[PDB]
Amino acid sequence: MVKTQRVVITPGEPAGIGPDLVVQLAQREWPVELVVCADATLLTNRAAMLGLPLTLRPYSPNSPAQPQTAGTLTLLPVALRAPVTAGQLAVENGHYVVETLARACDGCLNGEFAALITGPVHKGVINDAGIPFTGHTEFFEERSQAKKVVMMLATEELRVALATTHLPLRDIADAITPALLHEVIAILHHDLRTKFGIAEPRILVCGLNPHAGEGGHMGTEEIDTIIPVLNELRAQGMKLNGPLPADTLFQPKYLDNADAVLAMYHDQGLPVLKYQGFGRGVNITLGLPFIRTSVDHGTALELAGRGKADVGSFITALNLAIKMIVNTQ
Amino acid sequence: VKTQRVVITPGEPAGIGPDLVVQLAQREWPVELVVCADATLLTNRAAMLGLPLTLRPYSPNSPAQPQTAGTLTLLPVALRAPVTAGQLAVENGHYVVETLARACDGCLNGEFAALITGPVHKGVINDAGIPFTGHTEFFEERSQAKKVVMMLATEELRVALATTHLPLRDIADAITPALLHEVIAILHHDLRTKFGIAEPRILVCGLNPHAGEGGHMGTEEIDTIIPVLNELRAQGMKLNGPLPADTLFQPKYLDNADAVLAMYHDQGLPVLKYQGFGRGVNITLGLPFIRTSVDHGTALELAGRGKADVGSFITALNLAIKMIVNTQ
Numbered sequence: 001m002v003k004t005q006r007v008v009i010t011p012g013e014p015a016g017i018g019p020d021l022v023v024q025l026a027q028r029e030w031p032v033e034l035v036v037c038a039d040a041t042l043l044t045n046r047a048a049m050l051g052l053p054l055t056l057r058p059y060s061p062n063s064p065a066q067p068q069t070a071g072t073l074t075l076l077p078v079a080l081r082a083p084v085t086a087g088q089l090a091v092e093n094g095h096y097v098v099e100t101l102a103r104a105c106d107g108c109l110n111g112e113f114a115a116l117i118t119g120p121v122h123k124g125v126i127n128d129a130g131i132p133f134t135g136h137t138e139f140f141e142e143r144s145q146a147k148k149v150v151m152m153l154a155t156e157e158l159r160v161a162l163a164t165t166h167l168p169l170r171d172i173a174d175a176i177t178p179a180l181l182h183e184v185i186a187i188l189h190h191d192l193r194t195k196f197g198i199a200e201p202r203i204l205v206c207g208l209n210p211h212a213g214e215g216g217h218m219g220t221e222e223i224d225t226i227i228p229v230l231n232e233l234r235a236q237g238m239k240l241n242g243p244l245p246a247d248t249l250f251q252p253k254y255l256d257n258a259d260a261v262l263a264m265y266h267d268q269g270l271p272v273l274k275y276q277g278f279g280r281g282v283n284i285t286l287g288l289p290f291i292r293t294s295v296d297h298g299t300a301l302e303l304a305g306r307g308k309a310d311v312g313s314f315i316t317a318l319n320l321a322i323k324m325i326v327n328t329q
Numbered sequence: 330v331k332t333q334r335v336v337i338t339p340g341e342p343a344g345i346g347p348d349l350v351v352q353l354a355q356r357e358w359p360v361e362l363v364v365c366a367d368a369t370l371l372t373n374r375a376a377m378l379g380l381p382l383t384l385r386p387y388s389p390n391s392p393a394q395p396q397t398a399g400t401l402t403l404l405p406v407a408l409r410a411p412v413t414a415g416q417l418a419v420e421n422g423h424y425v426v427e428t429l430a431r432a433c434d435g436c437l438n439g440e441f442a443a444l445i446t447g448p449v450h451k452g453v454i455n456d457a458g459i460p461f462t463g464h465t466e467f468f469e470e471r472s473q474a475k476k477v478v479m480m481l482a483t484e485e486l487r488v489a490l491a492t493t494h495l496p497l498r499d500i501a502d503a504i505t506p507a508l509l510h511e512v513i514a515i516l517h518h519d520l521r522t523k524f525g526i527a528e529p530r531i532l533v534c535g536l537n538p539h540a541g542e543g544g545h546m547g548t549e550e551i552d553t554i555i556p557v558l559n560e561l562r563a564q565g566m567k568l569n570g571p572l573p574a575d576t577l578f579q580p581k582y583l584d585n586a587d588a589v590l591a592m593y594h595d596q597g598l599p600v601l602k603y604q605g606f607g608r609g610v611n612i613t614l615g616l617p618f619i620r621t622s623v624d625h626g627t628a629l630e631l632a633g634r635g636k637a638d639v640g641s642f643i644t645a646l647n648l649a650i651k652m653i654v655n656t657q
């Protein structure tokens with residue numbers, strides 16, 4: 001037989017919509033135990049504000065996991081630094097947020113949890129707390145000591161991975177080196193196989209310049225670097241199509257035959273993806289020893305505690321992580 | 330009110346332009362279709378395609394008449410050499426340029442209400458020894474336009490670009506306050522005068538991801554884009570601040586805007602094309618007159634085949650007609 005799996009969930013910024021969404025997630029049944037790494041009173045209070053029921057059971061590593069039943073959550077306690085008011089940032093709680101991220105990450109690394117699903121966090125308040133922080137991705141990449149991770153955004157079957165992420169537009173070109181493409185594609189191909197269960201992944205690659213450089217008249221990176229690397233990889237047996245113009249690549253004739261698209265940078269790949277799934281969009285981090293998914297939106301402070309939060313993205317992030325667990329177990 | 334005339338240039342004679350125009354002709358139109366080309370070229374390409382075609386002479390002294398199915402109105406310009414579909418003939422470069430000049434002058438003089446252009450081949454024109462820096466450039470110069478802004482639109486979305494075909498590494502330094510002021514002024518101006526929108530609402534993309542996230546991801550938004558937009562909003566222009574490109578393309582935004590200004594090519598066209606694709610139409614903003622254009626090349630390998638696909642030519646023409654209707 002199999003064992004009930006546990007997934008760890010970090011609601012994120014206490015004053016944002018993360019806690020609201022996690023209380024909303026809890027209103028249905030799940031085939032895994034949902035271990036929520038947060039402050040008990042925070043969830044209890046927020047649930048009351050939303051008029052939703054919630055009973056918390058303690059994370060108990062020395063007992064078998066049990067599927068999470070509606071109206072409940074399993075809690076791995078982490079104390080808040082200061083009292084919370086929905087919508088208002090409290091600098092000291094920045095340490096609390098990171099503490100939950102660290103504990104959740106470690107549990108995934110120690111094998112306590114089969115996946116990690118993150119709610120939104122406010123980077124500002126974390127830095128104000130004196131903790132350098134540029135996002136979950138960099139945080140997990142570093143704490144997990146992974147050589148490199150790749151960010152991916154996905155809806156149903158349409159998946160876009162990024163060669164570069166949150167960098168100024170002007171720093172992108174010089175970052176596209178043979179070393180980067182080799183690592184990024186290796187990780188993408190690897191995880192599509194190990195985490196997505198795709199035996200022979202087919203990757204669609206964007207050029208860096210409009211028209212993919214149009215034969216060198218619009219940039220030389222495709223001819224100088226991208227093409228040589230892709231062919232080096234195709235000789236290794238990888239199935240790659242491209243580089244292709246970004247404004248041409250997102251078509252059925254190309255997408256129907258690809259398991260993922262690799263964009264050279266953030267705004268080249270995400271706009272199409274987002275305009276294809278308001279909610280439903282899921283941020284996935286590839287290259288880590290464990291499965292990590294996440295909502296694809298912000299903390300929406302102005303909505304915290306008011307009852308009008310869209311749980312669509314968190315639900316899909318959770319569903320996806322659960323489905324990926326099998327491919328690894 | 331009164332029937333308007335639009336002028337159409339099929340373009341490179343050996344290309345698919347004539348093919349598309351002959352197909353365009355197979356239906357009725359609410360405007361008179363004045364095609365600036367060689368009569369023989371059109372009748373021959375018609376025969377090759379098995380489509381019927383009757384040409385009536387452009388008669389400026391008579392009232393314009395809506396174009397009837399199976400016909401086109403002709404503004405004659407003679408080929409310099411015989412045409413073979415699919416083969417470029419340098420001598421006909423002079424013919425191509427003459428049709429562009431005549432059509433352009435007609436739009437500047439009030440003879441025609443809009444110009445819809447078929448595909449042209451720059452290489453053959455240049456190889457004939459003819460100074461010519463490009464299709465839209467030709468019109469920009471002949472019309473004495475100071476600056477043009479390229480836009481791609483369908484019916485539910487209009488995307489203008491601050492920069493077009495530049496290597497990605499050249500974009501950042503190209504986004505200057507002067508370029509931005511210029512581009513937005515034209516965009517705001519034309520949404521008024523060419524699309525007939527009284528109080529245009531424009532969504533503006535940041536240059537950097539997350540619109541630079543308070544300077545944590547680039548400084549262009551704080552150093553350049555935000556100041557320019559602030560200045561223009563002070564002029565009543567409805568500009569929705571630099572928004573992250575990956576959140577901007579959404580109803581709470583789009584349904585509230587008449588156009589989106591993207592900073593560069595791959596930031597705005599992928600979504601436009603995904604939301605439409607063949608539905609796309611290129612509109613040149615900044616000229617003294619309305620000009621729309623097909624979105625494909627001369628496709629010489631398809632010329633005279635029968636698999637043309639006048640689809641995009643129809644969308645470009647329909648779009649120009651609507652613009653004429655909403656501005657008269």
Ligand SMILES: [Zn+2]
Pocket residue numbers: 166266538539
């Ligand atoms: Zn991002």
Ligand SMILES: [Zn+2]
Pocket residue numbers: 210211494594
């Ligand atoms: Zn282009």
